[PDB]
């Protein structure tokens, strides 16, 4: 499934992301845009054998298990497959844990390069009617 800008804004708000740990909704929508382009099915194989899964490209080396990664950690304690569904619940739950680290949303390279320091509020402006 691929979300529209406003549709995802609404789903993330409903999933308690708006202002979670100091990050307004526009940050999460922007992060999703540049990480997976709103695709819940997106997956990218990294150069070290690990793979990013889901709408927020969550890495299999430290957050989930796909059984295809060497000395892999599974901090979110889930099969990487659970991050690939039209229902973002698992993706959001793991993203909340991830952003609870001291690094915040810096964990996401795309967010650091395309969202941080910009008018992220623009991503949700003009939604809900």
């Amino acid at each position, epitope marked *: 499934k691929v979300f529209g800008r406003c549709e995802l804004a609404a789903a993330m708000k409903r*999933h308690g992301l708006d202002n979670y740990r100091g990050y307004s909704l526009g940050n999460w929508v922007c992060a999703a845009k540049f990480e997976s382009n709103f695709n819940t099915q997106a997956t990218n194989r990294n150069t070290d054998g690990s793979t990013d899964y889901g709408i927020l490209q969550i890495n299999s080396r430290w957050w989930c298990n796909d059984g295809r990664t060497p000395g892999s*950690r599974n*901090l979110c304690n889930i099969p990487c497959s659970a991050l690939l569904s039209s229902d973002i619940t698992a993706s959001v739950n793991c993203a*909340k844990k991830i952003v*609870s*680290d001291g*690094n915040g949303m810096n964990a996401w390279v795309a967010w650091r390069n395309r969202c941080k320091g910009t008018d992220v509020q623009a991503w949700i402006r003009g939604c809900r009617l």
Partner: antibody
Framework: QVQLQESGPGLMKPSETLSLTCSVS????????WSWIRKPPGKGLEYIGY???????YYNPSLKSRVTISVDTSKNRFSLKLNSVTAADTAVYYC???????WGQGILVTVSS | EIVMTQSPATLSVSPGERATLSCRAS??????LHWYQQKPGQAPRLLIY???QSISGIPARFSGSGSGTEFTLTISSLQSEDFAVYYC?????????FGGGTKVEIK
């Protein structure tokens, strides 16, 4: 399947430092998140703080910067250090994985004063 | 910090009856509210996370709902093993905070 076990003192004088450790078996202290919670006598639950993957630590401000939390990857355990204790810090301390899924037996610490 | 208000302090109910615990937050916390159950002598146990997400191994009679600042934990058929103290906790902002707790006892 993860087992947590608190260890420390039961009684100690004020102005001293309270030190607790939580040994984790069946799982690796790896780069996971660990927390400390306590329940004061006749009060509810209070969150002490936690340490995450990067090593960054978050401490409840109400504890006036007296707390320190660290991870011992060699001996697979994490700790809690509370300076300048007083009667107010008397409680049952619990260690737990940040996700709230796993908890220790809990240990009673009394600062008789 | 965000203040969590649990109501009532002591809920008295008879076995088999339904029970509703309320938790309010002084700030909007999305769905970042979790419920804990603590029986005497034991450590707290997670029952419901993120306001309504159920946990495998937990009786079906436990369910939560709500969002923003209003949350509710409903217990269908109160049983003997359901008698204990219940706490709500928000993870929306640091420091994380717990409500004062709600002691569910037999009537």
């Amino acid at each position: 399947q993860v087992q947590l076990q608190e260890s420390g003192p039961g009684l100690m004088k004020p102005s001293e430092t309270l030190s607790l450790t939580c040994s984790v078996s069946g799982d690796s202290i790896r780069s996971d998140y660990w927390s400390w919670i306590r329940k004061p006598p006749g009060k509810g639950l209070e969150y002490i703080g936690y340490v995450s993957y990067s090593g960054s630590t978050y401490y409840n401000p109400s504890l006036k910067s007296r707390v320190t939390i660290s991870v011992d990857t060699s001996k697979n355990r994490f700790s809690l250090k509370l300076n300048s204790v007083t009667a107010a810090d008397t409680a049952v301390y619990y260690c737990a994985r940040w996700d709230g899924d796993y908890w220790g037996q809990g240990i009673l610490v009394t600062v008789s004063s | 910090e965000i203040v969590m208000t649990q109501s009532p302090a002591t809920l008295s109910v008879s076995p088999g009856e339904r029970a509703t615990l309320s938790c309010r937050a002084s700030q909007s916390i999305g769905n970042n509210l979790h419920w804990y159950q603590q029986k005497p002598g034991q450590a707290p146990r997670l029952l419901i996370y993120y306001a309504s997400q159920s946990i495998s191994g937990i009786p079906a009679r436990f369910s939560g709902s709500g969002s923003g600042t209003e949350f509710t934990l409903t217990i269908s058929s109160l049983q003997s093993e359901d008698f204990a103290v219940y706490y709500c906790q928000q993870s929306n902002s640091w420091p994380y905070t717990f409500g004062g707790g709600t002691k569910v006892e037999i009537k």
